[PDB]
Design a protein around this nucleic acid. Structure first.
Ligand code: MG
Ligand code: MG
Length: 445
DNA sequence: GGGATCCTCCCAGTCGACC
DNA sequence: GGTCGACTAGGAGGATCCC
């Protein structure tokens, strides 16, 4: 930030990021982003010409070359650049943007695919990776997708992570202990357009990308934290759920707070965006409440609901470690007619991820895994264990684990992808006018 | 990135003008 | 008293601060 790096210079990054911490480094790398790339003088001059009309994903691929040329040595992977020179550049170390772009525009789909894989593997460190901040810039990531679809930036000038790891430990140790899984995924760019990008949290049963595996998106709920106090309605509802695991006691639990994770959606009614779980069966209704109707202007919603109202969630009540001397395991497992809210952000995020996993394969099963946590109490064991693994004494305690399947109608998946891609284009044009963008091939890819 | 308090917008059931 | 129109109940979703 005080020492912004140049993507077009032989200066050594390492020379500038030895001292800094793992967090000031990312700030230094945050200046090697796509946005900063586009606004570079070398790139402006090149674009200023009357012939040059840059398209995607060619321009993203060019960017990848320069980025990994700059940070190759730092992250300890020179494979990306080695492939660019070996297979794309005819064996020449291209240094000018005009020539790098030309060579990039002559890549086939198999070659873009190969780069994006190499990039995913080189960033499988995730947050621990300082390039993460440079890479995710200018791209529609899973967390920007929903926003991008509603046209509601893209280019720019933790405790929660500890809880996700807990949910991950749960899935790896308790659900899929007898299978080979993958706990670490890097940043995954779209090889076909270079405007979308994601990373996966966890995958079970992967071959030694696997189209037959199970991909989990890991989330966390905290609104259902409770102190172990007699008077506490949440705690009380929890005790009933803990002793009598089932839909009825689950309902009471969910509704023990003002703003529940589950919403009852009646016939011809429009689901709100309040939370990520819906129920269509009236058995989940509590008190009659007005609800906007599903008008003919909601065929998207209706199509998505159509394909997400059959396969039920799996609810896992976890053993309280206070009663089990530390060990946290599955006390009870039951199914529930609760489904993913297709209008909630979580639906979109897993939608993008499923789309991108497709490109890296050319179907796997997709689930949202959500852990419900509570703050530790004075009598909670400090050193808890989950199967073999241990639990961080500083992280909250998981009480519930709900796994919910997600399905994506091809027709809805497409319109949403294309809507976001258009917002990206309009933003690209507005943010970088000096660039005579060529989106002809984009509107069709 | 989730949660809660506050604040805005507006659909929908309510109820007011009126004949 | 009944149709329609205007009124207001909460539904619904954004922005901020906190953590
Ligand atoms: Mg996640
Ligand atoms: Mg989460």
């Amino acid at each position: 930030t005080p020492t912004p790096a140049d993507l077009f210079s032989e200066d050594y990054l390492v020379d500038t990021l030895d001292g800094l911490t793992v967090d000031d480094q990312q700030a230094v790398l945050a200046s090697l982003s796509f946005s900063k790339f586009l606004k570079h003088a070398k790139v402006r001059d090149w674009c200023a010409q009357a012939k040059i009309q840059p398209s995607m994903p060619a321009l993203r691929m060019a960017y990848n070359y320069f980025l990994f040329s700059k940070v190759g040595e730092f992250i300890g992977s020179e494979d990306v650049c080695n492939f660019f020179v070996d297979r794309v550049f005819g064996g020449v170390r291209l240094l000018d943007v005009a020539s790098v772009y030309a060579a990039c525009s002559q890549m086939n789909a198999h070659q873009r695919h190969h780069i994006c894989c190499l990039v995913e593997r080189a960033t499988s460190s995730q947050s621990l990776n300082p390039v993460w901040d440079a890479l995710r810039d200018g791209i529609i990531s899973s967390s920007k997708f929903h926003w991008a679809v509603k046209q509601q930036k893209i280019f720019s000038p933790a405790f929660g992570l500890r809880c996700e790891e807990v949910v991950k430990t749960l899935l790896a140790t308790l659900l899929h202990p007898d299978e080979t899984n993958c706990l670490d995924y890097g940043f995954m760019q779209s090889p076909q357009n270079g405007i979308f990008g994601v990373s996966l949290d966890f995958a079970a049963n992967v071959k030694t990308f696997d189209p037959n595996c199970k991909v989990y998106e890991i989330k966390c709920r905290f609104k259902y934290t409770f102190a172990k106090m007699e008077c506490d309605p949440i705690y009380a509802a929890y005790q009933r759920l803990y002793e009598a695991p089932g839909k009825l006691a689950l309902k009471d639990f969910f509704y023990s707070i003002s703003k529940p994770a589950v919403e009852y959606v009646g016939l011809g009614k429009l689901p709100s965006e309040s939370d990520y779980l819906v129920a269509y069966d009236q058995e989940w209704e509590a008190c009659p409440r007005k609800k906007r109707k599903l008008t003919p202007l909601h065929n998207l919603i209706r199509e998505c609901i159509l394909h997400n109202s059959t396969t039920e969630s799996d609810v896992y009540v976890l053993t309280d470690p206070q009663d089990t001397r530390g060990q946290i395991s599955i006390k009870a497992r039951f199914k529930a007619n609760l489904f993913v809210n297709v209008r909630h952000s979580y639906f979109y995020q897993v939608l993008l991820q499923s789309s991108i996993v497709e490109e890296y394969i050319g179907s796997p099963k997709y689930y949202i895994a959500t852990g419900f946590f509570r703050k530790r109490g004075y009598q909670d064991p400090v050193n808890c264990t989950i199967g073999g693994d241990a639990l961080d004494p500083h992280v909250e305690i998981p009480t519930l684990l709900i796994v919910t399947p997600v399905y994506f109608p091809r027709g809805a998946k497409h319109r949403l992808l294309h809507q976001a891609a258009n917002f990206w284009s309009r933003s690209a044009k507005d943010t970088f006018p000096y660039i005579k963008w060529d989106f002809s091939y984009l509107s069709a890819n």
